[PDB]
Design a protein around this ligand. Structure first.
Ligand SMILES: N[C@@H](Cc1c[nH]c2ccccc12)C(=O)O
Ligand SMILES: N[C@@H](Cc1c[nH]c2ccccc12)C(=O)O
Lengths: 101, 101
């Protein structure tokens, strides 16, 4: 249903915009503690590390599984989503997540 | 383990700070599409609606289940987390999520 998809999209943007405003008001931490579960906070921290290591290029995917405790399916999702991302985002992530050499 | 808890906390803050910076650079939407699954975007949109309706106070919890398709367990989590939240956050959410009367 296109109508239901439109409703889901509007609801998602409401979250995005709410959080934007929370950051501007220094309310982001309490908002994220309200809106997410502990397990989802843990998952998001792990996903940042997966991205950082995929961009770095030192560890193979099976080495990452072993080192981070994340399964191969999880790592593969990360890799495919990173390959699909806009170049501008990948370039920015390389600037922010990796140390200068 | 306190040491592992410290590691999880650091990783979570890295996400929080990454997203802060993404918003400042207008990269928030692509970052959130990279970092979250579709089902997690849907869940976050639904949770904003649950919070909005709990603060409004018009619908009972069983009415919300019926109207939003969310289970009673999900609504109860929302309600308990809202009651636990800092007053300043609740007050701000009332200002932003509800229309002026
Ligand atoms: N956008 C990704 C989210 C994701 C899942 N697992 C990950 C691991 C790392 C980074 C992102 C992810 C997806 O839809 O699959
Ligand atoms: N912080 C809540 C997250 C949550 C789960 N279900 C919800 C419904 C609405 C709002 C928040 C939630 C928790 O840990 O339980």
């Amino acid at each position: 249903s296109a109508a239901m998809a439109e409703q889901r999209h509007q609801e998602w943007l409401r979250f995005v915009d709410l959080l934007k405003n929370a950051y501007q008001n220094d309310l982001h931490l309490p908002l994220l503690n309200l809106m997410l579960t502990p397990d989802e906070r843990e998952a998001l921290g792990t996903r940042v590390r997966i991205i950082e290591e995929l961009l770095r290029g030192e560890m193979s995917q099976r080495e990452l599984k072993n080192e981070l405790g994340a399964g191969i399916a999880t790592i593969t999702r990360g890799s495919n989503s990173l390959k699909a991302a806009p170049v501008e985002l990948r370039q920015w992530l390389e600037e922010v997540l990796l140390k200068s050499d």
